[PDB]
Write a protein that binds this ligand. Structure first.
Ligand SMILES: *[C@@H]1O[C@H](CO)[C@@H](O[C@@H]2O[C@H](CO)[C@@H](O)[C@H](O)[C@H]2NC(C)=O)[C@H](O)[C@H]1NC(C)=O
Ligand code: C09
Ligand code: C09
Ligand code: NAG
Ligand code: NAG
Ligand code: NAG
Ligand code: NAG
Ligand code: NAG
Ligand code: NAG
Ligand code: NAG
Ligand code: NAG
Ligand code: NAG
Ligand code: NAG
Ligand code: NAG
Lengths: 772, 772
């Protein structure tokens, strides 16, 4: 099928629409640049290797390189692996780059470089040098970068990569860089805004530094700038999850009231963790197109009750005032200034961490007529009282977020306290209006808790303390609810009428409601499904279900049932036939997850008991020790079988005689040591086969007829125990010359033996002695 | 050191006091009885192997056998391995046993035998035939058992081992067995009490059968009988976790009022799951010494309110009336008859599963003067209301158990609903008065909740819904508390004064209180330890701790800290120095568990930061991939190091040069492929070393100086990758001839290679070709 096998340990792709020849050697444990890289190569990536130097020989023939990604070949000590520390900094010999006439991007982050590499071609638009040891910028070193548009210089002097002195930038160092659009000097121990900056800047990043004061002309020539981030200068350090040194005297970042006058094009302004106590309205008198404003992590609790500066921001789209609370105060209520009413373009307002005991309908009045408002985020506020009906007047909104409060009768999990949200490394919203009350203290629900909330499409009650028998009366006002997340509660299914008032419910999650399922002898009504006539997806994972008063679940609508992390091994105890048709009457069921159910064997009757349209069946992570493959004949619509992470030792003698429908067979992480003689013979339906992480020694051509592999959309073979003797001759040849996609040929499809070939890659193996 | 290496795959013990020479071949994957079993052998066990027949050859030389434990060499289908099914019944050949003149016990449970083995010697006192296929008992087959005292015949006909017919016992089958003391016919499809039984019976087990009626003379001669179990005849089948067939027409087991008249010696009467609606007092008219009575799983809810039979039970020690609730009824209160006051010897009263809404002080008045009462178990009753102060009148009690209720402002978890609690296979009570309120619905605690309870020594609040900031006021009445189990709640350590009112507290568990720790930026006061002046043990496992407002925990008392399942990897993020002395000021700390903390490397400073008396340190299950062994020098009292389940590849060059105190070094489940040349040289303190489950190929004598091996109490080496070539000569010789204790030499110290020897045990290895 191929005349010349590929030996290069890098993925090579063609996008001729883009006349790009892309060679990706990321994370291939290389200690040299490989030989034989195609000469037309456009994008060459060498991230996360251990290549210790660059030379004119490095890219000699790669004439058409537009991009070289050479990140993390010697990463700073405290950011990189301690088990494989870099012994030393990348060595860049002269004129390694001056030949690359078409080079537009050069990434050299995280190599412990000491100076800006010189000799760079004038075609270079982007230069990235983050996480090196360059902490003095000299205008002489920047001359080579005449045509640079994007320059990343951050993380060269901060706590995980210290330089132990102030960052130093020569006067007007960047000013002759007259096409420079983006300059990043974040995380750098910088002490003043460098001046003068080229007026063509659109984005300037100066956050997490040692800039104590802005001066009134620091930005006066930047009339094209659209994004300015000054965050984390004079940081608010209480409960900081990184080492944090505040400005002396509780001082804020001092910004003269006219400092922003020239930034007529500014769209985003970030003043996070600047210890601000006041927001002078004068800042914004000639910023009329501001759309995104971050004032999180300051001391603006008082200012939130006044906030006259809001009157100057009629186009602002999202406003963040999270975590401005006063230390050691538990205010009674949230005092929002009427000025909020002037935020007519506002779509997103976030006020986490204001911290107050009670939310009352009047307190949110300044927002009543903000007509574009879509998201209101009042999470992490320790709110104890909130009458949910007050959202009568917010049907308009997509998300109402009261996550993580104390109420009783998607942003990353660390977001507001992370040191650098934007550091680079080497959900029910779709259904409509969402009310997120996850991780609150709701211990009991009534119907009236939800009056005037009939418009809700998704309600998140995950992670409350609901320890209640539901009898179908608790959710009556929620006539439009399509998604209920009830996970992490203590639902007691005493009554099969539970949830039946949710007439429009399409998705129900009661995962991790194990409490009442873990008790001896208590009634459990798993047949509650029958009353839910449009239910499509039911998640009841990690419930430790081992007993059921009903012997069948029934639904004419349900297509996906996740039953992972239960004890069907107990329910299906050998000798007890009563639950072998637990799922038979889910007539439309298409996906069944019963992974992690301790099923070390499947009793006879399990397969006959499956509903008739089952497509995707996962039995993963069960410790399955045996499997009667013929019983797959019962599953006449089966397309995906996940048997991963078990203890199977054999494949069927003839897969086609087990299922003529099977498309994807996942057998990864088992104990299979050899294949059947005629395994895949006539399995022309098969499109995906994963045999990785087993113990196979040999694969012969009778097990793998190429009329079957010729349709195989991926064939996973890595991490086995291949023996590369003259017996393996057909397998080795076929692997080297095949069209079929086989991941990890460069790095984990290897011989275990004999002796000579141990650790050697199958792709690189020369078996000519077998043909003497 | 040994002249004759032991090669027999069985554990052999000498107890010269008794001459027992005990040969234990349990679960050794044997397919024949091994040869060379000592001829003095008294107790020989062959349980769980696959020996397919017994013959006179089997025990020919074993003259002095007193016991043959030969169970489960062919387990019934539904009870046995589905991956290694038994192909055919054990074959018992004639005169296999009749030579063994001193044989007193013979266990043949679980071999699918069809008849009682004949030819048995008259010395036999115990015969066990459980879980075979013998379901017709004939007097002709029992004549050989003249001197039998103990006979187990159960589980030969039930849902996990069906015989498809009624059990059949010939009239007076057992009557000439004139020394029979124990007869067990449980789980057998028995339909009537076999009669007449020998009057010498002390224990009769008839439970889980099909006996619908007791005849008034069925027990007429058993005046020596001490234990009678008739449970599971006419079972109560609601929510039964096994296939359950009740007697027609809801009928109970019918027991004539004079059925027990002869049982003047009866001490235990079990009538569990007999569907009883009444307990006639006349039953007990001639039983004065009854000590244990099990009336669980019946229909005695009304009778519990009357219960005149209790007046005939002044010697009763234990009473179980659990799970007598009425179907579909939720009674308001528990109506305990005044007769309970006549239970003058009662130590244990269990009334789980009565089901009632509120417990009130007067309802327990019938128990107020039961002077010996030690345990009151009202668990799994769905109690919603309870004034805890009412137990002021139960200060004498050891355990007050309200586990698994709905209260708001040790038996196995398999117990009352298990099919056979006694089926055989092939905690803070010590501190004083305990109030167990675990798994209830308490969401908020105040001081007055515990009024009048100052006598309590242990309180279990595990698994409630307490989502509260404690400030030292909540437990004020509990002045004698020594143990607080607060695990599985939502503790909020906003204040370091939490728990300080518990002045006598010695053990505190706040494990699995991760809720507020998984919230970014929230305050967490880990220095709350300082106020607890007699605190000895602190468990804060699985809290996902990743941040801390305080930088040091402090205690002058604490000796044990379990910190497993947190995120010290985040707290100790490389470059963040602030928490490297988190534990340093726990001055008396001797034991620290920081397993499962995602510590793939240890930052420098961690070891210097440990408190000075640390003795037992666990870094298990961390994904550790490197370890600076020299850093152990800081731990000058380190005696136990657990590095199990990590990714280590190397041991120190000289362990003695790393720690002069280290006694027990656990390295199991790592990636170690070789030992250093002088690994153990001069490690004179070392007494226990676990190198099992690694990838070791070779061990040379220089790593194992034999003056060090001689002080080892145990040296674990099993499950490695040993190479049995002529290079391994010293190791193979030393393993075979050493006195040092090495588990699994018979079963998992094996050659991986070369070719010829693969799978062979090192102990069986003949390397003479290496010495030609
Ligand atoms: C940022 O620069 C400051 C100097 O402005 C560094 O502080 C010096 O650090 C050295 C070595 O730690 C001390 O001996 C000096 O006394 C410090 N000087 C001053 C003026 O504080 C600081 O270490 C740098 N921080 C980082 C993260 O690189
Ligand atoms: C031993 C009791 O077994 C039957 C039973 N199950 C439940 C239950 N899940 N929840 C309940 C809630 C309130 C009252 C009773 C029950 C109940 N009763
Ligand atoms: C937003 C971060 O401010 C710090 C803070 N932490 C807590 C806390 N753990 N618990 C609390 C309980 C009630 C009120 C406030 C707090 C609180 N505040
Ligand atoms: C390839 O590199 C060029 C030059 O830096 C870059 O603009 C482009 O996005 C990259 N494209 C692909 C497909 O890798
Ligand atoms: C608000 O809360 C109260 C309960 O305190 C309730 O009576 C009332 O009807 C609720 N509804 C609205 C629209 O606020
Ligand atoms: C509900 O919130 C939890 C945690 O706050 C989150 O994990 C889950 O995704 C949410 N549910 C939905 C349906 O998005
Ligand atoms: C369900 O319980 C609710 C709340 O207690 C009550 O309104 C209703 O009467 C109950 N319905 C039924 C059918 O029992
Ligand atoms: C569910 O099953 C139980 C017992 O099997 C029965 O009492 C109840 O009526 C059923 N409810 C349904 C089918 O909705
Ligand atoms: C308790 O129930 C018993 C039995 O039905 C009855 O004799 C008695 O009157 C009841 N007493 C109380 C206080 O409920
Ligand atoms: C509980 O009992 C105590 C002692 O008699 C009493 O003072 C207290 O009021 C009772 N509490 C309640 C909630 O009834
Ligand atoms: C508290 O109860 C839980 C479960 O209810 C149990 O796991 C734990 O052992 C108990 N605590 C003590 C100290 O016995
Ligand atoms: C601590 O909490 C309790 C909660 O009721 C309160 O009585 C007390 O005033 C609080 N403050 C203290 C003890 O300083
Ligand atoms: C505990 O540490 C916190 C954080 O520094 C501090 O505010 C408090 O005073 C300390 N309290 C005690 C009792 O050590
Ligand atoms: C390790 O060896 C060196 C050289 O003999 C010695 O000076 C040092 O004290 C030793 N350390 C320990 C802990 O024995």
């Amino acid at each position: 099928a191929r005349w010349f096998p590929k030996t290069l340990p890098c993925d090579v792709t063609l996008d001729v629409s883009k006349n790009h020849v892309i060679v990706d050697c990321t994370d291939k444990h290389l200690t040299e640049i490989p030989g034989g890289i195609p000469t037309n190569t456009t994008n060459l990536t060498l991230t996360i290797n251990h290549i210790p130097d660059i030379s004119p020989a490095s890219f000699h023939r790669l004439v058409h390189l537009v991009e070289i990604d050479f990140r993390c070949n010697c990463v700073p000590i405290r950011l990189g692996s301690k088990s494989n520390m870099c012994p030393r900094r990348l060595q860049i010999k002269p004129r390694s780059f001056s030949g690359l006439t078409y080079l537009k991007s050069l990434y050299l982050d995280g190599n412990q470089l000491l100076e800006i590499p010189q000799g760079l071609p004038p075609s270079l638009q982007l230069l990235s040098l983050e996480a090196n040891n360059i902490f003095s910028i000299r205008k002489e070193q920047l001359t080579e970068l005449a045509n640079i548009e994007i320059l990343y210089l951050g993380q060269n002097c901060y706590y995980r990569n210290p330089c132990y002195v102030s960052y130093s930038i020569e006067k007007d160092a960047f000013l002759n860089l007259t096409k420079l659009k983006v300059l990043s000097l974040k995380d750098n121990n910088v002490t003043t805004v460098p001046t003068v900056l080229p007026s063509t800047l659109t984005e300037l990043y100066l956050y997490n530094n040692m800039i104590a004061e802005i001066q009134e002309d620091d930005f006066n020539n930047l009339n094209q700038l659209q994004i300015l981030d000054l965050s984390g200068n004079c940081p608010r350090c209480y409960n900081a999850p990184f080492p944090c040194t505040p400005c002396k005297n509780n001082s804020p970042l001092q910004i003269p009231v006219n400092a922003f006058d020239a930034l007529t094009e500014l769209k985003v302004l970030r003043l996070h963790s600047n210890s601000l106590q006041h927001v002078p309205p004068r800042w914004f008198k000639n910023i009329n197109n501001l759309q995104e404003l971050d004032l999180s992590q300051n001391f603006l609790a008082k200012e939130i009750g006044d906030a006259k500066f809001l009157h100057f921001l009629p186009n602002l789209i999202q406003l963040d005032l999270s975590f401005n609370f006063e230390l050691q105060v538990y205010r009674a209520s949230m005092n929002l200034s009427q000025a909020f009413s002037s935020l007519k373009s506002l779509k997103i307002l976030r006020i986490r961490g204001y911290v107050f005991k009670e939310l009352k309908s009047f307190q949110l009045s300044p927002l009543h007529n903000l007509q574009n408002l879509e998201v209101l985020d009042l999470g992490t506020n320790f709110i104890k009282i909130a009458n949910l009906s007050m959202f009568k007047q917010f049907k308009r909104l997509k998300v109402i977020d009261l996550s993580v409060n104390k109420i009783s009768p998607v942003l990353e999990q660390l977001y507001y306290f992370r040191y650098d949200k934007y550091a680079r490394s080497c959900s029910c919203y779709k259904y409509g209006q969402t009310l997120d009350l996850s991780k609150n203290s709701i211990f009991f629900i009534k119907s009236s808790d939800f009056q005037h909330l009939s418009f809700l499409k998704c309600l998140n009650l995950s992670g409350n303390l609901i320890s209640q028998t539901l009898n179908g009366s608790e959710f009556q006002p929620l006539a439009e609810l399509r998604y209920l997340d009830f996970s992490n509660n203590r639902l007691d299914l005493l009554h099969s009428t539970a949830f039946e008032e949710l007439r429009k419910l399409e998705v129900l999650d009661i995962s991790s409601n194990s409490h009442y399922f873990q008790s001896e002898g208590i009634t459990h009504m798993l047949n509650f499904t029958k009353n839910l006539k449009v239910l499509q997806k039911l998640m009841m994972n990690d419930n430790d279900i081992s007993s059921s008063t009903s012997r069948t679940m029934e639904s004419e609508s349900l297509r996906t049932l996740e039953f992972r992390g239960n004890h069907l091994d107990v329910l299906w105890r050998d000798g007890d036939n009563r639950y072998l048709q637990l799922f038979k009457n889910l007539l439309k069921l298409e996906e069944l997850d019963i992974s992690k159910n301790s099923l070390s064997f499947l009793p006879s009757g399990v397969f006959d008991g499956m509903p008739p349209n089952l497509k995707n069946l996962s039995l993963a992570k069960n410790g399955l020790k045996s499997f009667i493959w013929e019983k797959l004949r019962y599953l006449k619509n089966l397309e995906t079988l996940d048997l991963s992470h078990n203890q199977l030792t054999t494949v069927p003698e003839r897969l086609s005689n087990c299922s003529r429908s099977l498309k994807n067979l996942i057998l990864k992480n088992n104990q299979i040591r050899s294949l059947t003689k005629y395994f895949l013979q006539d399995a022309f339906q098969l499109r995906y086969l994963d045999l990785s992480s087993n113990k196979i020694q040999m694969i012969q051509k009778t097990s793998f007829p190429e009329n079957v592999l010729n349709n195989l959309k991926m064939l996973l073979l890595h991490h086995n125990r291949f023996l590369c003797t003259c017996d393996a001759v057909w397998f080795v040849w076929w692997v080297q010359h095949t069209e079929v996609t086989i991941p990890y040929l460069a790095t984990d499809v290897t011989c275990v033996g004999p002796g000579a070939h141990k650790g050697q890659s199958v792709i690189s193996l020369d078996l000519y002695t077998c043909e003497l």
